Symmetry: D2
Subunit: 114 residues, 4 copies
Amino acid sequence: ATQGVFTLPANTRFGVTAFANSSGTQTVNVLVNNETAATFSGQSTNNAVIGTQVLNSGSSGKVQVQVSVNGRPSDLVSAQVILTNELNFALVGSEDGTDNDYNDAVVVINWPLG
Amino acid sequence: ATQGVFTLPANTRFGVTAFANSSGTQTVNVLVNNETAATFSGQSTNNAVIGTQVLNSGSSGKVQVQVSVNGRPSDLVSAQVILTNELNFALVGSEDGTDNDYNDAVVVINWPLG
Amino acid sequence: ATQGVFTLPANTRFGVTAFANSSGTQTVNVLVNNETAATFSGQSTNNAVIGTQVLNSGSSGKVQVQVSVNGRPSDLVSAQVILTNELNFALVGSEDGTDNDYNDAVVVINWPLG
Amino acid sequence: ATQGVFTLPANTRFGVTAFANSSGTQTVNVLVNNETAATFSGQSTNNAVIGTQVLNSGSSGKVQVQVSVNGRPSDLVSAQVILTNELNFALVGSEDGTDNDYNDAVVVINWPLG
Ligand SMILES: C[C@@H]1O[C@@H](NC(=O)c2ccccc2)[C@@H](O)[C@H](O)[C@@H]1O
Ligand SMILES: C[C@@H]1O[C@@H](NC(=O)c2ccccc2)[C@@H](O)[C@H](O)[C@@H]1O
Ligand SMILES: C[C@@H]1O[C@@H](NC(=O)c2ccccc2)[C@@H](O)[C@H](O)[C@@H]1O
Ligand SMILES: C[C@@H]1O[C@@H](NC(=O)c2ccccc2)[C@@H](O)[C@H](O)[C@@H]1O
Ligand SMILES: [Ca+2]
Ligand SMILES: [Ca+2]
Ligand SMILES: [Ca+2]
Ligand SMILES: [Ca+2]
Ligand SMILES: [Ca+2]
Ligand SMILES: [Ca+2]
Ligand SMILES: [Ca+2]
Ligand SMILES: [Ca+2]
């Protein structure tokens, strides 16, 4: 099944934050309006926050997360959770290696903001 | 129901990150084994990270999040999600006011690391 | 926080199923736009499916689950999860007692159908 | 990423319930101890329950859901959710066709029971 693609409410501000847990340099691209809107890169085995940004989901609401290591796409796993019918998280893990920890790049999207 | 309490695997490193979306200064306490191990304080209405730390779950694995504003405990909402039977998130929202957006402090716990 | 209240897409068919895990007879009420649409009841310590029904979310999309035992309201816990940006579950547990297993009545709402 | 595989606590009873939403007759296999422990079969486009059973997760705790239609394996999507640090759901959707509704067989695993 397709992973790393989320339909947000249209025209909504959201937070996106990426963490790294791998020997390899992680590249995270976040797409809105089907165009890259934020990019984060870095190597950490200590859960570094390789970047955090506020973005706008735009007229379609479509947000896509892509992860690669030196151009090689990582395998993604994702889901969305809603708490008290109001607070939304879109969650992504990614695997760059063989161990299947799926924490090599972790991405968390949250909305609403403010 | 009790919210903001999670049983992690024992003696495991985990990441904890807090975001703020409120006029009020948020104070996040992270307890391991019923003692405060990390505290984050900050103010933002734009999802700013007010703290990030790597902790160890210790012999019990018991991790608790508490949030206060101006010494008043916030109401919490929480859940844990596991992706591909490997990647764990414990998610907390909190409400310091009347709008029930539950984003006033948002806390993301993730494991494993490395 | 409020629990057991879900906003579904409007005018959508959804499934609702209830399971029992208690010495007490559970009564599960499912409200659509604040009116009882389904009522299930039974007594099992072995996960009996005490009712299952297909309902329509109608114009508001508001679905609420309430549980009573001993004519006393049970305490609820809930969340919504979305898989592959398409498959939705609204999950409810309830506690009628003191052991806080929150499985005394379990309710699962799923959509889309067909 | 692997889907439909869950690590439960060892030697623990769990419920498994399967629903159908497809023209195709669904075959749901639940493996424990890497051996088939239960098989459900049926057809519905109205979310009918095609099977419900209580199984034991065994010494490993490894539970695996597989779905097939006329001997062709369906593509799975899954996740686990924990509410109030006590109530666990393992959720599976499956796709046997081209519309990617992932509801053709839906499987809900819940524990603990009793
Ligand atoms: C330190 C190590 O770094 C990566 N592993 C590798 O890059 C790797 C690639 C190929 C073969 C073996 C290891 C990660 O996938 C792994 O989870 C771990 O964080
Ligand atoms: C900016 C504003 O800040 C807080 N609101 C208050 O401090 C507040 C003040 C007065 C009355 C009610 C609430 C938050 O709870 C609210 O979600 C919003 O983020
Ligand atoms: C079998 C038992 O049934 C209820 N418990 C009681 O009825 C109860 C009886 C006596 C004292 C306290 C509670 C449940 O809350 C409990 O989770 C368990 O399923
Ligand atoms: C009624 C219909 O039944 C199946 N569809 C098919 O059997 C199908 C498979 C391949 C091509 C066309 C149809 C399902 O995948 C679909 O979601 C819908 O529930
Ligand atoms: Ca890895
Ligand atoms: Ca890793
Ligand atoms: Ca608020
Ligand atoms: Ca707020
Ligand atoms: Ca109970
Ligand atoms: Ca019980
Ligand atoms: Ca289908
Ligand atoms: Ca279908």
